[PDB]
Every structure is written in C-alpha cells, then in structure tokens.
Amino acid sequence: GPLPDGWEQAMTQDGEIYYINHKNKTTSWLDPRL
Amino acid sequence: TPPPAYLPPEDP
C-alpha cells in the first residue's frame, strides 16, 4: 500500500485496514490513497 | 463508526 503521506495501515479485529497519520493526528478507516 | 483512537500503529 502506497500511503498519501506515508501513514500506516493496520489490520484491526473489526475487520478494517485502518489508516492513522501522526501528521493528520487522526484515525481513518479505509485507504486514503484510493 | 469510530475506529481505534489516535494511536501509534499496530501490526499483529
């Protein structure tokens, strides 16, 4: 996965590959890069 | 819905 700013996508048990950015200071669900 | 809070990132 090629992230926008380079921020991490992780598999949570909820069944979501989440995107969180320390530059964004926020937790977003789906790939922002799409 | 809300995902996990603003957090440093998880792998397992």
Side-chain angles (χ1 to χ4, degrees):
Chain A
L3 303 353
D5 304 76
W7 49 291
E8 176 66 293
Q9 176 272 94
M11 305 172 300
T12 186
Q13 311 179 92
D14 186 66
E16 287 299 299
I17 60 185
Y18 78 61
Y19 277 81
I20 60 185
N21 196 341
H22 281 69
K23 171 175 168 290
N24 278 334
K25 185 171 285 293
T26 173
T27 303
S28 184
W29 286 119
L30 261 194
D31 58 316
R33 46 66 52 184
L34 201 168
Chain B
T1 47
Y6 171 49
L7 283 178
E10 44 216 275
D11 180 270

